[PDB]
Design a binder for this molecule. Structure first.
Ligand code: A1JHI
Ligand code: GDP
Ligand code: MG
Lengths: 101, 85, 146, 168
Protein backbone atom coordinates (compact mmCIF):
# COMPACT_ATOMS: atom_id res chain seq x y z
CA UNK A 1 0.00 0.00 0.00
CA UNK A 2 2.66 2.50 1.08
CA UNK A 3 5.72 3.10 -1.10
CA UNK A 4 8.74 4.98 0.22
CA UNK A 5 10.65 7.20 -2.20
CA UNK A 6 13.56 9.62 -2.37
CA UNK A 7 12.93 12.27 -5.01
CA UNK A 8 16.23 13.57 -6.38
CA UNK A 9 17.22 16.60 -8.47
CA UNK A 10 20.79 17.96 -8.59
CA UNK A 11 21.87 17.96 -4.94
CA UNK A 12 18.36 17.85 -3.46
CA UNK A 13 16.80 14.63 -2.13
CA UNK A 14 13.26 14.49 -0.70
CA UNK A 15 12.40 11.52 1.51
CA UNK A 16 8.64 11.07 1.38
CA UNK A 17 6.04 8.31 1.24
CA UNK A 18 2.91 7.85 -0.83
CA UNK A 19 0.18 5.33 -1.48
CA UNK A 20 0.73 2.74 -4.19
CA UNK A 21 -2.67 3.75 -5.62
CA UNK A 22 -1.83 7.48 -5.61
CA UNK A 23 -1.08 9.00 -9.01
CA UNK A 24 2.01 10.72 -10.39
CA UNK A 25 0.16 14.05 -10.41
CA UNK A 26 -0.62 13.70 -6.70
CA UNK A 27 3.09 13.11 -6.09
CA UNK A 28 3.92 16.31 -7.98
CA UNK A 29 1.58 18.16 -5.62
CA UNK A 30 3.58 16.75 -2.70
CA UNK A 31 6.74 18.15 -4.30
CA UNK A 32 4.92 21.45 -4.84
CA UNK A 33 4.38 21.90 -1.11
CA UNK A 34 8.12 21.44 -0.51
CA UNK A 35 9.96 22.93 -3.49
CA UNK A 36 7.33 25.58 -4.29
CA UNK A 37 6.95 24.59 -7.94
CA UNK A 38 3.58 23.71 -9.46
CA UNK A 39 3.02 20.28 -11.05
CA UNK A 40 2.88 21.87 -14.51
CA UNK A 41 6.60 22.67 -14.09
CA UNK A 42 7.69 19.24 -12.83
CA UNK A 43 8.76 16.11 -14.69
CA UNK A 44 9.08 12.88 -12.71
CA UNK A 45 11.15 9.88 -13.79
CA UNK A 46 11.62 6.30 -12.68
CA UNK A 47 15.17 5.61 -13.83
CA UNK A 48 14.93 7.09 -17.36
CA UNK A 49 11.16 6.70 -17.80
CA UNK A 50 9.04 9.84 -17.95
CA UNK A 51 6.03 9.22 -15.69
CA UNK A 52 2.53 10.04 -16.95
CA UNK A 53 0.48 12.09 -14.48
CA UNK A 54 -2.54 9.82 -14.90
CA UNK A 55 -0.81 6.59 -13.93
CA UNK A 56 -0.69 5.47 -10.31
CA UNK A 57 2.65 4.93 -8.61
CA UNK A 58 2.06 1.18 -8.67
CA UNK A 59 1.48 1.29 -12.42
CA UNK A 60 4.85 3.05 -12.78
CA UNK A 61 6.69 0.26 -10.93
CA UNK A 62 6.77 1.45 -7.31
CA UNK A 63 5.58 -1.41 -5.10
CA UNK A 64 5.99 -2.25 -1.43
CA UNK A 65 8.62 -4.82 -2.43
CA UNK A 66 10.71 -2.25 -4.37
CA UNK A 67 10.00 0.95 -2.33
CA UNK A 68 10.79 0.05 1.28
CA UNK A 69 11.42 2.51 4.14
CA UNK A 70 14.95 1.13 4.56
CA UNK A 71 15.45 1.01 0.76
CA UNK A 72 13.42 3.73 -0.97
CA UNK A 73 13.05 3.86 -4.73
CA UNK A 74 14.66 6.81 -6.50
CA UNK A 75 12.42 9.25 -8.39
CA UNK A 76 14.11 11.72 -10.72
CA UNK A 77 12.74 15.26 -10.88
CA UNK A 78 13.17 17.96 -13.55
CA UNK A 79 11.97 21.57 -13.46
CA UNK A 80 10.90 23.75 -16.38
CA UNK A 81 11.50 24.25 -21.88
CA UNK A 82 12.15 21.45 -19.40
CA UNK A 83 15.68 20.81 -18.23
CA UNK A 84 17.43 17.51 -18.79
CA UNK A 85 17.28 15.26 -15.75
CA UNK A 86 20.40 15.76 -13.63
CA UNK A 87 21.12 13.84 -10.41
CA UNK A 88 24.41 14.68 -8.72
CA UNK A 89 25.93 11.45 -7.34
CA UNK A 90 26.40 10.91 -3.63
CA UNK A 91 29.82 10.55 -2.07
CA UNK A 92 31.70 7.26 -2.09
CA UNK A 93 32.78 5.16 0.92
CA UNK A 94 36.48 4.32 1.31
CA UNK A 95 38.03 1.02 0.35
CA UNK A 96 36.94 -1.77 2.66
CA UNK A 97 39.61 -2.42 5.33
CA UNK A 98 41.25 -5.82 5.23
CA UNK A 99 40.08 -6.44 8.80
CA UNK A 100 36.60 -6.44 7.23
CA UNK A 101 37.73 -8.75 4.36
CA UNK B 1 6.59 20.24 8.59
CA UNK B 2 9.92 19.27 7.03
CA UNK B 3 13.58 19.60 7.97
CA UNK B 4 16.51 20.12 5.61
CA UNK B 5 19.78 18.33 6.36
CA UNK B 6 22.96 19.42 4.59
CA UNK B 7 25.77 16.94 4.14
CA UNK B 8 29.44 17.85 4.31
CA UNK B 9 29.64 17.79 0.51
CA UNK B 10 26.58 20.08 0.11
CA UNK B 11 23.79 17.59 -0.61
CA UNK B 12 20.38 18.70 0.69
CA UNK B 13 18.12 16.05 2.27
CA UNK B 14 14.54 17.12 3.00
CA UNK B 15 12.84 14.85 5.55
CA UNK B 16 9.68 15.06 7.64
CA UNK B 17 10.35 16.85 10.93
CA UNK B 18 9.13 13.86 12.96
CA UNK B 19 11.63 11.68 11.09
CA UNK B 20 14.56 13.98 11.88
CA UNK B 21 13.65 14.11 15.59
CA UNK B 22 14.55 10.40 15.78
CA UNK B 23 18.11 11.69 16.16
CA UNK B 24 18.90 12.97 19.64
CA UNK B 25 21.48 15.41 18.30
CA UNK B 26 19.06 16.92 15.76
CA UNK B 27 16.34 17.06 18.43
CA UNK B 28 18.60 19.16 20.65
CA UNK B 29 19.37 21.63 17.86
CA UNK B 30 15.67 22.10 17.18
CA UNK B 31 14.28 24.30 9.50
CA UNK B 32 17.80 23.63 8.18
CA UNK B 33 20.67 21.76 9.83
CA UNK B 34 24.21 21.63 8.46
CA UNK B 35 26.52 18.66 9.13
CA UNK B 36 30.20 19.01 8.26
CA UNK B 37 30.86 15.57 9.74
CA UNK B 38 28.53 13.41 7.61
CA UNK B 39 29.06 12.86 3.85
CA UNK B 40 26.16 12.47 1.44
CA UNK B 41 26.16 8.68 1.03
CA UNK B 42 26.07 8.33 4.82
CA UNK B 43 23.48 11.02 5.51
CA UNK B 44 21.28 9.49 2.80
CA UNK B 45 21.49 6.13 4.59
CA UNK B 46 20.73 7.90 7.88
CA UNK B 47 17.52 9.32 6.41
CA UNK B 48 16.52 5.81 5.32
CA UNK B 49 16.84 4.76 8.95
CA UNK B 50 14.65 7.71 9.99
CA UNK B 51 11.72 6.57 7.84
CA UNK B 52 12.47 2.97 8.88
CA UNK B 53 12.25 3.83 12.58
CA UNK B 54 9.05 5.88 12.32
CA UNK B 55 7.40 3.24 10.14
CA UNK B 56 8.25 0.17 12.24
CA UNK B 57 8.19 1.46 15.82
CA UNK B 58 5.23 -0.18 17.55
CA UNK B 59 4.46 -1.95 14.29
CA UNK B 60 1.81 -4.65 14.36
CA UNK B 61 3.47 -6.40 11.38
CA UNK B 62 6.85 -8.13 11.43
CA UNK B 63 9.87 -5.82 11.29
CA UNK B 64 12.47 -6.35 8.53
CA UNK B 65 16.20 -6.25 9.10
CA UNK B 66 17.82 -2.89 8.53
CA UNK B 67 20.46 -3.55 5.84
CA UNK B 68 23.99 -2.15 6.12
CA UNK B 69 26.60 -2.75 3.44
CA UNK B 70 30.09 -3.50 4.87
CA UNK B 71 31.59 -0.58 2.92
CA UNK B 72 29.36 1.94 4.74
CA UNK B 73 29.32 0.25 8.16
CA UNK B 74 32.18 2.13 9.81
CA UNK B 75 31.15 5.60 8.63
CA UNK B 76 27.50 4.90 9.48
CA UNK B 77 28.50 3.87 12.99
CA UNK B 78 30.27 7.19 13.53
CA UNK B 79 27.30 9.15 12.15
CA UNK B 80 24.81 7.34 14.38
CA UNK B 81 27.11 7.87 17.38
CA UNK B 82 27.20 11.58 16.54
CA UNK B 83 23.47 11.84 15.81
CA UNK B 84 22.43 9.76 18.86
CA UNK B 85 20.02 7.53 16.93
CA UNK C 1 15.05 -11.25 45.89
CA UNK C 2 15.19 -10.35 42.16
CA UNK C 3 12.07 -8.53 41.02
CA UNK C 4 12.14 -10.07 37.51
CA UNK C 5 11.32 -13.69 38.28
CA UNK C 6 8.60 -16.21 37.54
CA UNK C 7 5.68 -16.76 39.89
CA UNK C 8 5.42 -20.35 41.15
CA UNK C 9 1.79 -20.65 40.11
CA UNK C 10 1.84 -24.32 38.95
CA UNK C 11 -1.18 -23.46 36.78
CA UNK C 12 -0.55 -24.67 33.19
CA UNK C 13 -0.91 -22.22 30.30
CA UNK C 14 -0.70 -23.15 26.62
CA UNK C 15 1.40 -20.66 24.62
CA UNK C 16 2.42 -20.40 20.95
CA UNK C 17 5.97 -19.19 20.31
CA UNK C 18 6.09 -17.68 16.81
CA UNK C 19 9.41 -16.43 15.39
CA UNK C 20 8.44 -13.67 12.95
CA UNK C 21 12.08 -12.46 12.80
CA UNK C 22 14.97 -13.29 10.43
CA UNK C 23 17.02 -14.48 13.44
CA UNK C 24 17.26 -17.78 15.29
CA UNK C 25 15.40 -17.06 18.52
CA UNK C 26 16.70 -18.23 21.89
CA UNK C 27 13.72 -18.36 24.27
CA UNK C 28 14.95 -17.49 27.76
CA UNK C 29 12.85 -18.27 30.83
CA UNK C 30 13.43 -16.40 34.08
CA UNK C 31 13.11 -19.07 36.76
CA UNK C 32 11.66 -18.54 40.24
CA UNK C 33 15.01 -17.03 41.33
CA UNK C 34 15.32 -14.62 38.40
CA UNK C 35 18.04 -16.59 36.61
CA UNK C 36 17.93 -16.98 32.80
CA UNK C 37 17.32 -20.55 31.60
CA UNK C 38 17.73 -21.19 27.83
CA UNK C 39 15.11 -23.29 26.01
CA UNK C 40 15.21 -24.91 22.53
CA UNK C 41 15.71 -22.41 19.72
CA UNK C 42 13.29 -21.42 16.95
CA UNK C 43 14.52 -21.06 13.37
CA UNK C 44 13.07 -18.05 11.52
CA UNK C 45 9.42 -18.26 10.50
CA UNK C 46 8.78 -21.20 12.85
CA UNK C 47 5.99 -21.68 15.36
CA UNK C 48 5.84 -23.99 18.37
CA UNK C 49 3.07 -24.84 20.81
CA UNK C 50 4.77 -24.70 24.21
CA UNK C 51 3.62 -25.69 27.71
CA UNK C 52 4.11 -22.91 30.26
CA UNK C 53 2.48 -21.65 33.47
CA UNK C 54 0.70 -18.52 34.67
CA UNK C 55 2.91 -15.69 35.84
CA UNK C 56 6.09 -17.02 34.18
CA UNK C 57 8.51 -14.49 32.64
CA UNK C 58 9.98 -14.88 29.14
CA UNK C 59 12.39 -12.91 26.98
CA UNK C 60 13.82 -13.74 23.57
CA UNK C 61 17.31 -13.20 22.15
CA UNK C 62 19.30 -13.99 19.02
CA UNK C 63 20.65 -17.48 19.62
CA UNK C 64 24.07 -16.69 18.16
CA UNK C 65 24.70 -13.08 19.20
CA UNK C 66 22.21 -12.59 22.08
CA UNK C 67 20.90 -9.48 20.29
CA UNK C 68 17.68 -8.32 21.90
CA UNK C 69 14.31 -9.19 20.42
CA UNK C 70 10.72 -8.16 21.12
CA UNK C 71 7.70 -10.28 21.99
CA UNK C 72 4.25 -8.74 21.39
CA UNK C 73 5.92 -5.35 20.82
CA UNK C 74 7.63 -5.37 24.25
CA UNK C 75 10.65 -6.80 26.08
CA UNK C 76 8.97 -9.39 28.32
CA UNK C 77 6.20 -11.97 27.90
CA UNK C 78 4.08 -13.16 30.83
CA UNK C 79 1.32 -15.65 29.93
CA UNK C 80 -1.81 -15.62 32.06
CA UNK C 81 -4.55 -18.27 32.24
CA UNK C 82 -6.05 -19.45 28.95
CA UNK C 83 -9.63 -18.26 28.38
CA UNK C 84 -11.70 -21.30 27.32
CA UNK C 85 -8.56 -23.21 26.35
CA UNK C 86 -7.53 -20.86 23.60
CA UNK C 87 -3.74 -20.39 23.39
CA UNK C 88 -1.90 -17.21 24.29
CA UNK C 89 0.11 -15.99 21.31
CA UNK C 90 3.69 -14.73 21.57
CA UNK C 91 4.79 -12.93 18.39
CA UNK C 92 8.59 -12.68 18.43
CA UNK C 93 10.03 -9.96 16.18
CA UNK C 94 13.07 -7.81 15.75
CA UNK C 95 13.02 -4.54 17.66
CA UNK C 96 13.71 -1.24 15.96
CA UNK C 97 17.36 -1.15 16.93
CA UNK C 98 19.01 2.21 17.25
CA UNK C 99 21.12 2.89 14.18
CA UNK C 100 24.25 2.83 16.36
CA UNK C 101 23.39 -0.58 17.82
CA UNK C 102 22.53 -1.99 14.39
CA UNK C 103 25.87 -0.70 13.12
CA UNK C 104 27.63 -2.34 16.07
CA UNK C 105 25.93 -5.62 15.15
CA UNK C 106 27.11 -5.45 11.53
CA UNK C 107 30.69 -4.51 12.47
CA UNK C 108 30.74 -7.25 15.12
CA UNK C 109 29.67 -9.73 12.42
CA UNK C 110 32.39 -8.58 9.98
CA UNK C 111 35.49 -7.90 12.12
CA UNK C 112 37.12 -10.35 14.47
CA UNK C 113 37.23 -9.23 18.13
CA UNK C 114 41.03 -9.26 18.09
CA UNK C 115 41.00 -6.75 15.18
CA UNK C 116 38.25 -4.55 16.66
CA UNK C 117 40.83 -1.90 17.60
CA UNK C 118 42.34 -1.94 14.08
CA UNK C 119 39.35 0.00 12.69
CA UNK C 120 39.48 3.66 11.56
CA UNK C 121 37.02 4.83 14.24
CA UNK C 122 37.04 6.67 17.58
CA UNK C 123 38.43 4.95 20.67
CA UNK C 124 35.00 5.36 22.29
CA UNK C 125 33.55 3.00 19.67
CA UNK C 126 36.24 0.38 20.38
CA UNK C 127 34.57 -0.10 23.77
CA UNK C 128 31.08 -0.17 22.25
CA UNK C 129 32.11 -2.95 19.87
CA UNK C 130 33.50 -5.08 22.72
CA UNK C 131 30.39 -4.55 24.91
CA UNK C 132 28.56 -7.51 23.40
CA UNK C 133 24.86 -8.12 24.16
CA UNK C 134 24.43 -9.45 27.69
CA UNK C 135 21.29 -11.02 29.14
CA UNK C 136 22.35 -10.52 32.76
CA UNK C 137 23.09 -6.83 32.15
CA UNK C 138 19.77 -6.28 30.35
CA UNK C 139 18.03 -7.72 33.40
CA UNK C 140 19.65 -5.05 35.58
CA UNK C 141 18.48 -2.32 33.21
CA UNK C 142 14.94 -3.73 33.11
CA UNK C 143 14.95 -4.09 36.91
CA UNK C 144 15.90 -0.43 37.31
CA UNK C 145 13.50 0.83 34.62
CA UNK C 146 10.78 -0.80 36.75
CA UNK D 1 27.41 -55.41 22.47
CA UNK D 2 25.34 -52.24 22.10
CA UNK D 3 23.69 -50.56 25.08
CA UNK D 4 20.26 -48.90 25.21
CA UNK D 5 19.31 -46.67 28.16
CA UNK D 6 15.57 -46.95 28.78
CA UNK D 7 13.53 -44.88 31.25
CA UNK D 8 10.06 -45.94 32.44
CA UNK D 9 7.96 -42.96 33.53
CA UNK D 10 4.32 -42.39 34.44
CA UNK D 11 2.12 -41.71 37.45
CA UNK D 12 2.56 -43.67 40.67
CA UNK D 13 0.86 -47.04 40.58
CA UNK D 14 0.53 -47.37 36.81
CA UNK D 15 2.76 -50.48 36.80
CA UNK D 16 6.22 -49.12 36.05
CA UNK D 17 7.83 -51.46 38.57
CA UNK D 18 5.64 -54.43 37.62
CA UNK D 19 6.35 -53.96 33.92
CA UNK D 20 10.09 -53.74 34.56
CA UNK D 21 10.35 -56.72 36.91
CA UNK D 22 8.24 -58.79 34.50
CA UNK D 23 10.70 -58.04 31.68
CA UNK D 24 13.92 -58.88 33.53
CA UNK D 25 12.89 -61.36 36.24
CA UNK D 26 9.91 -62.91 34.41
CA UNK D 27 7.42 -62.80 37.28
CA UNK D 28 4.63 -60.49 38.44
CA UNK D 29 5.12 -58.47 41.63
CA UNK D 30 1.79 -57.71 43.33
CA UNK D 31 3.07 -55.01 45.73
CA UNK D 32 6.41 -53.34 44.99
CA UNK D 33 7.37 -50.34 47.16
CA UNK D 34 6.20 -47.20 45.30
CA UNK D 35 9.34 -45.45 46.62
CA UNK D 36 12.15 -47.70 45.39
CA UNK D 37 13.73 -46.34 42.22
CA UNK D 38 16.38 -48.57 40.70
CA UNK D 39 18.08 -49.43 37.44
CA UNK D 40 18.06 -52.92 35.95
CA UNK D 41 20.40 -54.39 33.33
CA UNK D 42 19.54 -57.28 31.03
CA UNK D 43 21.18 -58.93 28.04
CA UNK D 44 18.52 -59.50 25.38
CA UNK D 45 18.47 -60.50 21.72
CA UNK D 46 16.32 -58.06 19.76
CA UNK D 47 16.01 -58.66 15.99
CA UNK D 48 19.17 -60.78 16.11
CA UNK D 49 21.24 -58.13 17.93
CA UNK D 50 22.52 -58.82 21.44
CA UNK D 51 21.86 -55.69 23.50
CA UNK D 52 22.39 -54.51 27.05
CA UNK D 53 19.20 -52.84 28.24
CA UNK D 54 19.72 -50.32 31.05
CA UNK D 55 16.19 -49.81 32.41
CA UNK D 56 15.49 -47.00 34.89
CA UNK D 57 12.32 -47.68 36.90
CA UNK D 58 11.62 -44.17 38.15
CA UNK D 59 9.87 -43.56 41.45
CA UNK D 60 9.43 -40.92 44.11
CA UNK D 61 8.18 -37.36 44.31
CA UNK D 62 8.80 -34.82 41.57
CA UNK D 63 12.15 -33.08 41.62
CA UNK D 64 12.97 -30.43 39.01
CA UNK D 65 16.59 -29.97 40.03
CA UNK D 66 19.55 -29.85 37.68
CA UNK D 67 20.73 -33.22 39.02
CA UNK D 68 17.43 -35.00 38.30
CA UNK D 69 17.16 -33.18 34.97
CA UNK D 70 20.55 -34.51 33.89
CA UNK D 71 19.85 -38.04 35.15
CA UNK D 72 16.76 -38.24 32.94
CA UNK D 73 18.70 -36.53 30.12
CA UNK D 74 20.87 -39.65 29.78
CA UNK D 75 17.92 -41.84 28.81
CA UNK D 76 17.87 -42.59 25.09
CA UNK D 77 14.26 -43.78 25.15
CA UNK D 78 11.24 -43.31 27.37
CA UNK D 79 8.36 -45.63 28.18
CA UNK D 80 5.42 -43.38 29.09
CA UNK D 81 3.07 -45.61 31.08
CA UNK D 82 -0.52 -45.06 32.18
CA UNK D 83 -3.13 -47.44 33.56
CA UNK D 84 -6.30 -48.03 31.53
CA UNK D 85 -8.30 -47.95 34.79
CA UNK D 86 -7.03 -44.50 35.81
CA UNK D 87 -7.95 -41.40 33.82
CA UNK D 88 -5.63 -39.11 35.80
CA UNK D 89 -2.65 -41.29 34.85
CA UNK D 90 -3.64 -40.84 31.20
CA UNK D 91 -4.04 -37.08 31.73
CA UNK D 92 -0.57 -36.90 33.28
CA UNK D 93 1.05 -38.29 30.11
CA UNK D 94 1.17 -34.82 28.53
CA UNK D 95 3.18 -33.47 31.46
CA UNK D 96 5.63 -36.39 31.37
CA UNK D 97 6.24 -35.94 27.63
CA UNK D 98 6.70 -32.19 28.12
CA UNK D 99 9.40 -32.75 30.73
CA UNK D 100 11.09 -35.30 28.43
CA UNK D 101 11.12 -32.75 25.60
CA UNK D 102 12.65 -30.13 27.92
CA UNK D 103 15.59 -32.19 29.14
CA UNK D 104 16.24 -33.80 25.75
CA UNK D 105 16.30 -30.34 24.09
CA UNK D 106 14.30 -31.87 21.24
CA UNK D 107 10.73 -32.72 20.32
CA UNK D 108 11.70 -35.96 18.53
CA UNK D 109 12.64 -38.23 21.42
CA UNK D 110 12.28 -42.02 21.05
CA UNK D 111 9.31 -42.90 23.25
CA UNK D 112 6.44 -45.38 23.43
CA UNK D 113 2.99 -44.89 24.96
CA UNK D 114 2.05 -47.85 27.16
CA UNK D 115 -1.44 -48.65 28.41
CA UNK D 116 -0.89 -51.04 31.31
CA UNK D 117 -3.28 -53.27 33.30
CA UNK D 118 -5.06 -54.28 30.09
CA UNK D 119 -6.11 -57.47 31.92
CA UNK D 120 -8.45 -55.42 34.13
CA UNK D 121 -12.09 -55.13 32.98
CA UNK D 122 -12.73 -51.74 34.66
CA UNK D 123 -11.56 -49.63 31.74
CA UNK D 124 -11.78 -45.86 32.10
CA UNK D 125 -9.53 -44.74 29.19
CA UNK D 126 -10.59 -45.79 25.70
CA UNK D 127 -8.05 -47.41 23.40
CA UNK D 128 -9.11 -44.98 20.65
CA UNK D 129 -8.20 -42.04 22.90
CA UNK D 130 -4.74 -43.52 23.43
CA UNK D 131 -4.33 -44.31 19.73
CA UNK D 132 -5.21 -40.70 18.89
CA UNK D 133 -2.80 -39.40 21.53
CA UNK D 134 -0.03 -41.62 20.17
CA UNK D 135 -0.75 -40.50 16.60
CA UNK D 136 -0.50 -36.81 17.53
CA UNK D 137 2.84 -37.54 19.20
CA UNK D 138 4.02 -39.75 16.32
CA UNK D 139 4.87 -42.64 18.64
CA UNK D 140 3.62 -46.23 18.82
CA UNK D 141 0.99 -47.16 21.38
CA UNK D 142 1.16 -50.60 22.99
CA UNK D 143 -1.38 -52.19 25.33
CA UNK D 144 0.32 -54.17 28.09
CA UNK D 145 -0.42 -56.22 31.19
CA UNK D 146 2.51 -56.99 33.49
CA UNK D 147 0.27 -59.63 35.10
CA UNK D 148 -0.52 -61.64 31.94
CA UNK D 149 2.74 -60.54 30.20
CA UNK D 150 0.65 -59.17 27.30
CA UNK D 151 2.68 -56.79 25.16
CA UNK D 152 5.46 -56.48 27.76
CA UNK D 153 8.33 -57.65 25.54
CA UNK D 154 6.74 -55.71 22.69
CA UNK D 155 6.66 -52.41 24.59
CA UNK D 156 10.34 -52.57 25.53
CA UNK D 157 11.57 -54.00 22.21
CA UNK D 158 9.63 -51.39 20.22
CA UNK D 159 11.27 -48.61 22.25
CA UNK D 160 14.64 -50.12 21.36
CA UNK D 161 13.70 -50.07 17.67
CA UNK D 162 12.54 -46.46 18.00
CA UNK D 163 16.00 -45.63 19.35
CA UNK D 164 17.69 -47.45 16.45
CA UNK D 165 15.66 -45.57 13.82
CA UNK D 166 16.50 -42.38 15.72
CA UNK D 167 20.19 -43.38 15.80
CA UNK D 168 20.28 -43.40 11.97
C1 A1JHI E 1 10.22 -26.57 36.76
C2 A1JHI E 1 10.03 -26.39 35.26
C3 A1JHI E 1 10.07 -27.73 34.53
C4 A1JHI E 1 8.78 -25.50 34.93
C5 A1JHI E 1 8.22 -25.76 33.52
O1 A1JHI E 1 7.62 -26.79 33.28
N1 A1JHI E 1 8.34 -24.78 32.60
C6 A1JHI E 1 8.95 -23.47 32.84
C7 A1JHI E 1 8.37 -22.63 31.72
O2 A1JHI E 1 7.06 -22.16 32.07
C8 A1JHI E 1 8.28 -23.61 30.56
C9 A1JHI E 1 7.82 -24.91 31.24
C10 A1JHI E 1 8.39 -26.13 30.52
O3 A1JHI E 1 9.52 -26.54 30.78
N2 A1JHI E 1 7.59 -26.71 29.63
C11 A1JHI E 1 8.00 -27.89 28.87
C12 A1JHI E 1 8.66 -27.53 27.57
C13 A1JHI E 1 9.07 -28.52 26.68
C14 A1JHI E 1 9.68 -28.20 25.48
C15 A1JHI E 1 9.90 -26.87 25.13
C16 A1JHI E 1 10.45 -26.15 24.04
N3 A1JHI E 1 10.39 -24.85 24.23
N4 A1JHI E 1 9.79 -24.68 25.45
C17 A1JHI E 1 9.55 -23.34 25.96
C18 A1JHI E 1 9.48 -25.87 26.02
C19 A1JHI E 1 8.87 -26.19 27.23
N5 A1JHI E 1 7.69 -25.53 35.91
N6 A1JHI E 1 7.25 -24.35 36.41
N7 A1JHI E 1 6.19 -24.62 37.14
C20 A1JHI E 1 5.96 -25.97 37.10
C21 A1JHI E 1 6.92 -26.56 36.32
C22 A1JHI E 1 6.98 -28.04 36.13
C23 A1JHI E 1 5.65 -28.68 36.51
C24 A1JHI E 1 5.08 -28.19 37.84
C25 A1JHI E 1 3.75 -28.86 38.17
C26 A1JHI E 1 3.78 -30.38 38.26
C27 A1JHI E 1 2.79 -31.03 39.21
N8 A1JHI E 1 2.89 -32.53 39.22
C28 A1JHI E 1 2.34 -33.08 40.51
C29 A1JHI E 1 1.57 -34.37 40.35
C30 A1JHI E 1 2.18 -35.59 39.67
N9 A1JHI E 1 3.18 -35.29 38.66
C31 A1JHI E 1 4.38 -35.93 38.77
N10 A1JHI E 1 4.58 -36.67 39.87
C32 A1JHI E 1 5.76 -37.31 39.93
C33 A1JHI E 1 6.71 -37.24 38.94
C34 A1JHI E 1 6.40 -36.46 37.84
C35 A1JHI E 1 7.37 -36.30 36.74
N11 A1JHI E 1 7.33 -35.32 35.88
O4 A1JHI E 1 8.46 -35.56 35.05
C36 A1JHI E 1 9.03 -36.66 35.55
C37 A1JHI E 1 10.32 -37.14 34.92
C38 A1JHI E 1 10.87 -38.27 35.80
C39 A1JHI E 1 10.04 -37.68 33.49
C40 A1JHI E 1 10.33 -36.72 32.35
C41 A1JHI E 1 11.75 -36.20 32.41
C42 A1JHI E 1 11.98 -35.62 33.77
S1 A1JHI E 1 13.08 -34.31 34.02
C43 A1JHI E 1 12.68 -34.23 35.70
N12 A1JHI E 1 13.26 -33.33 36.51
C44 A1JHI E 1 11.72 -35.19 36.02
C45 A1JHI E 1 11.20 -35.32 37.35
N13 A1JHI E 1 10.75 -35.45 38.39
C46 A1JHI E 1 11.32 -35.99 34.90
N14 A1JHI E 1 8.43 -37.17 36.56
N15 A1JHI E 1 5.24 -35.79 37.73
C47 A1JHI E 1 2.86 -34.37 37.54
C48 A1JHI E 1 2.08 -35.06 36.44
C49 A1JHI E 1 2.19 -33.10 38.03
C50 A1JHI E 1 4.83 -26.68 37.76
N1 GDP F 1 -4.08 -56.11 37.04
C1 GDP F 1 -2.85 -55.56 36.86
N2 GDP F 1 -2.26 -54.94 37.92
C2 GDP F 1 -1.04 -54.38 37.80
C3 GDP F 1 -0.35 -54.44 36.51
N3 GDP F 1 0.83 -53.81 36.68
C4 GDP F 1 0.89 -53.38 37.97
N4 GDP F 1 -0.23 -53.73 38.64
C5 GDP F 1 -0.59 -53.46 40.05
O1 GDP F 1 -0.60 -52.05 40.27
C6 GDP F 1 -0.01 -51.76 41.54
C7 GDP F 1 1.06 -50.69 41.36
O2 GDP F 1 2.03 -51.19 40.44
P1 GDP F 1 3.57 -50.74 40.55
O3 GDP F 1 4.48 -51.78 39.94
O4 GDP F 1 3.96 -50.45 41.98
O5 GDP F 1 3.54 -49.44 39.61
P2 GDP F 1 4.44 -48.13 39.85
O6 GDP F 1 4.05 -47.39 41.11
O7 GDP F 1 4.26 -47.25 38.64
O8 GDP F 1 5.89 -48.53 39.86
C8 GDP F 1 0.61 -53.04 42.08
O9 GDP F 1 -0.12 -53.49 43.23
C9 GDP F 1 0.46 -54.06 40.97
O10 GDP F 1 0.09 -55.35 41.46
C10 GDP F 1 -1.05 -55.14 35.41
O11 GDP F 1 -0.52 -55.23 34.28
N5 GDP F 1 -2.26 -55.65 35.65
MG1 MG G 1 7.31 -48.33 41.37
Amino acid sequence: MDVFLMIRRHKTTIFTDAKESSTVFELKRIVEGILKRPPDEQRLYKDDQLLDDGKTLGECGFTSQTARPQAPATVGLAFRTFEALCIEPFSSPPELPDVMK
Amino acid sequence: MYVKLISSDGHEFIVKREHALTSGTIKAMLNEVNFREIPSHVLSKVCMYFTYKVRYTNSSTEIPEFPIAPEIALELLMAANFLDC
Amino acid sequence: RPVLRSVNSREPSQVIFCNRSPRVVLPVWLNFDGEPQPYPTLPPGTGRRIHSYRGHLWLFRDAGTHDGLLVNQTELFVPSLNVDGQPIFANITLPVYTLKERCLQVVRSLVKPENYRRLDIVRSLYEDLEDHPNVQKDLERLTQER
Amino acid sequence: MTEYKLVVVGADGVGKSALTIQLIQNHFVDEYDPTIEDSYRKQVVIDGETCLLDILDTAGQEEYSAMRDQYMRTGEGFLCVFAINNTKSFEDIHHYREQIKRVKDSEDVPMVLVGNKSDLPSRTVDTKQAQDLARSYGIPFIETSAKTRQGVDDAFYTLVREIRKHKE
